[PDB]
Design an enzyme around this catalytic site. Structure first.
Site, mmCIF file in Angstrom:
data_model
loop_
_atom_site.group_PDB
_atom_site.id
_atom_site.type_symbol
_atom_site.label_atom_id
_atom_site.label_comp_id
_atom_site.label_asym_id
_atom_site.label_seq_id
_atom_site.Cartn_x
_atom_site.Cartn_y
_atom_site.Cartn_z
ATOM 1 N N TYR A 191 0.758 -1.218 -0.110
ATOM 2 C CA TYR A 191 0.024 0.164 0.095
ATOM 3 C C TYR A 191 0.910 1.334 -0.063
ATOM 4 O O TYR A 191 0.656 2.211 0.574
ATOM 5 C CB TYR A 191 -0.749 -0.120 1.135
ATOM 6 N N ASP A 251 -12.981 -16.766 8.135
ATOM 7 C CA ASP A 251 -11.645 -16.557 7.499
ATOM 8 C C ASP A 251 -10.709 -16.368 8.724
ATOM 9 O O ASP A 251 -10.620 -15.278 9.506
ATOM 10 C CB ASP A 251 -11.567 -15.213 6.674
ATOM 11 N N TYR A 264 -11.365 -7.596 6.605
ATOM 12 C CA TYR A 264 -10.429 -7.515 5.714
ATOM 13 C C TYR A 264 -10.256 -9.060 5.312
ATOM 14 O O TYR A 264 -10.173 -9.875 6.261
ATOM 15 C CB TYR A 264 -9.089 -6.919 6.076
ATOM 16 N N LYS A 279 -1.482 -16.735 7.693
ATOM 17 C CA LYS A 279 -0.431 -15.996 8.217
ATOM 18 C C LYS A 279 0.742 -16.743 8.965
ATOM 19 O O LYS A 279 1.900 -16.587 8.721
ATOM 20 C CB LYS A 279 -0.585 -14.545 8.690
HETATM 21 O O1 LIG Z 1 -1.199 -1.904 4.787
HETATM 22 C C1 LIG Z 1 -2.061 -2.857 4.576
HETATM 23 N N1 LIG Z 1 -1.332 -4.256 4.691
HETATM 24 C C2 LIG Z 1 -0.045 -4.499 5.122
HETATM 25 C C3 LIG Z 1 0.462 -3.852 6.274
HETATM 26 C C4 LIG Z 1 1.847 -4.138 6.349
HETATM 27 C C5 LIG Z 1 2.430 -5.292 5.682
HETATM 28 S S1 LIG Z 1 3.859 -5.995 5.928
HETATM 29 N N2 LIG Z 1 3.419 -7.116 4.910
HETATM 30 N N3 LIG Z 1 2.546 -7.029 4.388
HETATM 31 C C6 LIG Z 1 1.853 -6.198 4.981
HETATM 32 C C7 LIG Z 1 0.656 -5.701 4.480
HETATM 33 N N4 LIG Z 1 -3.118 -3.043 4.552
HETATM 34 C C8 LIG Z 1 -3.827 -1.487 4.184
HETATM 35 C C9 LIG Z 1 -5.377 -1.164 4.681
HETATM 36 N N5 LIG Z 1 -6.184 -2.642 4.664
HETATM 37 C C10 LIG Z 1 -7.447 -2.517 4.653
HETATM 38 C C11 LIG Z 1 -8.229 -2.727 5.671
HETATM 39 C C12 LIG Z 1 -9.675 -2.698 5.324
HETATM 40 C C13 LIG Z 1 -9.976 -2.717 4.121
HETATM 41 C C14 LIG Z 1 -9.186 -2.984 2.995
HETATM 42 C C15 LIG Z 1 -7.715 -2.982 3.361
HETATM 43 C C16 LIG Z 1 -5.110 -3.871 5.036
HETATM 44 C C17 LIG Z 1 -3.982 -4.193 4.556
HETATM 45 C C1 LIG Z 2 -3.960 -10.765 5.736
HETATM 46 C C2 LIG Z 2 -5.284 -11.180 5.537
HETATM 47 C C3 LIG Z 2 -5.636 -11.923 4.408
HETATM 48 C C4 LIG Z 2 -4.656 -11.725 3.111
HETATM 49 O O1 LIG Z 2 -3.772 -12.673 3.348
HETATM 50 P P1 LIG Z 2 -2.382 -12.211 2.068
HETATM 51 O O2 LIG Z 2 -1.478 -13.537 2.402
HETATM 52 O O3 LIG Z 2 -1.901 -10.840 2.534
HETATM 53 O O4 LIG Z 2 -2.951 -12.372 0.833
HETATM 54 C C5 LIG Z 2 -6.918 -12.571 4.362
HETATM 55 N N1 LIG Z 2 -7.752 -12.403 5.525
HETATM 56 C C6 LIG Z 2 -7.489 -12.163 6.764
HETATM 57 C C7 LIG Z 2 -8.217 -12.108 7.731
HETATM 58 C C8 LIG Z 2 -6.130 -11.454 6.694
HETATM 59 O O5 LIG Z 2 -5.826 -11.056 7.886
#
Ligand SMILES: O=C(Nc1ccc2snnc2c1)N1CCN(c2ccccc2)CC1
Ligand SMILES: *Cc1c(COP(=O)(O)O)cnc(C)c1O
Ligand SMILES: O=C(Nc1ccc2snnc2c1)N1CCN(c2ccccc2)CC1
Ligand SMILES: *Cc1c(COP(=O)(O)O)cnc(C)c1O
Lengths: 429, 429
Positions: free
Chosen positions: B18, B247, B150, B276
């Site tokens: 992001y 999830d 999310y 994760k």
């Molecule tokens: O910055 C991130 N994800 C993220 C943050 C830190 C790390 S470190 N490695 N991967 C990462 C992903 N997001 C931005 C806002 N996000 C979000 C929350 C609600 C709906 C849609 C996106 C979750 C993912």
């Molecule tokens: C991080 C996350 C995902 C997506 O996983 P990625 O490996 O980043 O694609 C989906 N669902 C939940 C609840 C998460 O926290």
């Protein structure tokens, strides 16, 4: 677990690619080892050594358990397994981004790492959509491709897969409706490009990008294509202001006889995806590259960022092995190696042309195809190939191979011999 | 490359999660090693050891470079790095599938491996849609969720993400329009469940599934809800014939104080996602589990197969380390470990409740959150935490931690003290 126990657990609990649970005509074969070009498989309770003619679904370009890649993995494992890529950076990501920028078609200056090919395709589409949105043109949201393609299994990726091959007929209403040109022909025909242009012209104002596999369409039917079509695509896209995206997940890294298939035409796309052979078949990793222009336009847009970020983004372990695999390829005369492999496939497959059930024999770099007049029965083909010391997995009407680059001339001839014998059996029904 | 060269390459060529290219407010910090609960980061050109309070984005549950997990990976590397899962099976896949079926909520009998959380969510959706198509109900193709969630970054996963967090505003006319219930409350209110049911009822004929994060909503705001809401969703879904998908990509493997958060409610979903922490933070791997009923119905339908198959499906290296990570978790008194961690978080974060900028302090298992009345400035918060030997990354108005399970009482005190001081600096405007 014994091989018997593995089979028991598998039948009851494991999904396989594009498979059922409990309705498999052919049981999977237990693999117990992999070294160089060879797999150790269990056949009737006995371990047998067979050639990985498929490079494990186009991944194992340097063979399995290569000392340089094994060592790359363990040396990174010693220092740093993984860190989050949010707010942190590291040497494996930097080294790999530098390499990829320097070897891909000119102008591809930024790198987004993800964990799979399908994700990299979604990332490419997101880059294209956010780009046009950054230009104040959100109407440009559809994608155009030609038929016969494959781009992965996530829902956006599916929308540009061949509508017949991807059985889109049962994804009625759920899949994004994209623009499809007819199947691109093998030989160059200016009439095809003119018709592609005429169709794109009707949709230019709603199109974000043209997305194609360059030169070789893999999973869609192993069809090759003339590179001159890519020159036409680049020209059309430039004139109509539509982005060009090349999916090189299959291809990348020497597979077609050039480092990247785009190189066969000297063409630079605006966005490019790589994946299968990126880590030399050790670990899942993919990358999406885009131009500085695309990156700056996205970064200056309403979001101020590309709205994507996988958990294991730029994983140090996967990046380290990829660094090693790419350097290993570049540190040798890979072009001569692939030319020699292609020569071996061509020589070995020529005899199949005379077989009753064979409609075509074709080779492009380290890819060899026998096209048959009927779908190939895996219940016959699999054991037949195994009896000849080779792991082959046909699909549809195609007996094909994409062997590791380390295969000796003798091993290539063993592979082609098995392919010929499978094709002979197909006509023997 | 030196840390300075890494920064140079990174600024020119690397996307982060992001992030922009060329418009980053703060440079990422170079990470040079990771061991146990500690990262070695470069600050003022010198390496410093800091606590990974985030578990590297939820992944590093056993800490980095755990000897058992390093060993597991190295042992698998010596036998078989990877083979294709099309037509072959292997011991790491079987062992992991067996473990996962045995430890997940009752009834989840089949396992589809993929290479990330977002893909496993798309697989889950595909199972749900193919399930209803197999029952002769193709109208049931929409998804329902509650706000604040999310589910990943691929296009279908985005469609059920929180509309604000996901900036759905700039994705109008591209994302599938799904059904959203209001934000689920912390405290249990039967009225909320009744309203959820009423909303679901009017859409039941077009809904394939309800998809939610159980107990803890992670990336959408670190919000906790009473487990009884999940008992209600199971009931609603049963009576109205809509599949339930949990999830657990963030909540899985002990994080919330139960092995899986669903266990707090004593309920089983029809489909479950994990990711994760599956590999203990070594490698990208995810899984989607489903009931025998779902698997059989799909397998009896028109495709005769689940139409998905990632290249690196069931990768032996990733599966091997995952087996080790799970066995390591199950082979200790993990429940007492998480209880002690939760106790340490609560005690350490209590002093924050009285701070002028603090609206809430909340803990659930090994998760600790300080919610503030304004956004947290990363340019201030990051160096403040680093000075205290802690790596923290706030987002929005949240200062939070999900520390490795191996963190000692002293390390938890160090983590919480750093968090409290970040919160203090927020109130100083
Ligand atoms: O910055 C991130 N994800 C993220 C943050 C830190 C790390 S470190 N490695 N991967 C990462 C992903 N997001 C931005 C806002 N996000 C979000 C929350 C609600 C709906 C849609 C996106 C979750 C993912
Ligand atoms: C991080 C996350 C995902 C997506 O996983 P990625 O490996 O980043 O694609 C989906 N669902 C939940 C609840 C998460 O926290
Ligand atoms: O069996 C596969 N793929 C496959 C995928 C992953 C792995 S991993 N090991 N073997 C595999 C085979 N297909 C992918 C391509 N397919 C396809 C989909 C849409 C349009 C055209 C082809 C269907 C069959
Ligand atoms: C295999 C492939 C993909 C999908 O890659 P996965 O890693 O299986 O998600 C996408 N595009 C092309 C051209 C491919 O060959």
């Amino acid at each position: 677990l014994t091989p018997e126990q593995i089979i028991a657990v598998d039948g009851a609990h494991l999904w396989h690619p594009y498979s059922s649970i409990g309705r498999e005509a052919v049981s999977p074969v237990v693999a117990v080892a992999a070294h160089g070009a060879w797999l150790t498989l269990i056949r009737d309770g006995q371990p047998i050594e067979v050639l990985d003619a498929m490079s494990s679904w186009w991944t194992a370009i340097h063979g399995h358990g290569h000392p340089a890649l094994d060592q790359a993995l363990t040396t990174q494992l010693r220092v740093m397994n993984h860190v989050m890529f949010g707010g942190l950076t590291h040497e494996p990501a930097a080294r790999l981004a530098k390499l990829l920028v320097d070897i891909t078609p000119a102008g591809l200056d930024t790198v987004f790492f993800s964990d799979s090919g399908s994700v990299s395709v979604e990332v490419a589409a997101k880059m294209a959509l956010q780009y046009w949105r950054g230009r104040g043109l959100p109407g440009k949201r559809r994608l155009m491709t030609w038929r016969g393609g494959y781009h992965g299994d996530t829902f956006l990726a599916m929308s540009i897969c061949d509508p017949h091959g991807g059985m889109h007929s049962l994804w009625t209403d759920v899949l994004a409706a994209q623009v499809f040109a007819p199947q691109v022909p093998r030989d160059y025909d200016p009439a095809y490009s003119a018709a592609f242009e005429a169709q794109l012209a009707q949709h230019a104002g709603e199109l974000a990008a043209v997305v194609v596999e360059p030169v070789v369409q893999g999973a869609g039917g192993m069809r090759f294509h003339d590179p001159r079509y890519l020159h036409d695509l680049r020209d059309i896209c430039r004139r109509y202001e539509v982005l060009l995206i090349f999916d090189e997940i299959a291809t990348g890294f020497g597979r077609t006889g050039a480092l990247f298939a785009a190189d066969h035409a000297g063409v630079s796309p605006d966005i490019m995806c790589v994946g299968k052979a990126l880590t030399g078949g050790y670990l899942s990793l993919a990358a999406t590259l885009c131009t500085a222009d695309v990156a700056h336009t996205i970064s200056a847009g309403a979001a101020g960022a590309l709205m994507h970020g996988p958990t294991f983004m730029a994983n140090p372990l996967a990046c380290a092995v990829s660094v090693a695999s790419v350097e290993l390829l570049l540190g040798q005369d890979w072009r001569t190696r692939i030319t020699e492999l292609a020569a071996g496939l061509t020589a070995g497959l020529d005899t199949a042309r005379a077989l009753p059930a064979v409609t075509d024999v074709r080779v492009c770099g380290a890819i060899g195809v026998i096209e048959c007049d009927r779908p190939v029965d895996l219940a016959v083909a699999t054991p037949a190939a195994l009896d000849r010391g080779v792991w082959l997995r046909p699909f549809r009407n195609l007996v094909y191979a994409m062997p590791p680059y380390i295969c000796t001339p003798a091993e290539i001839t063993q592979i082609t011999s098995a392919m010929v014998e499978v094709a002979r059996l197909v006509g023997s029904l």
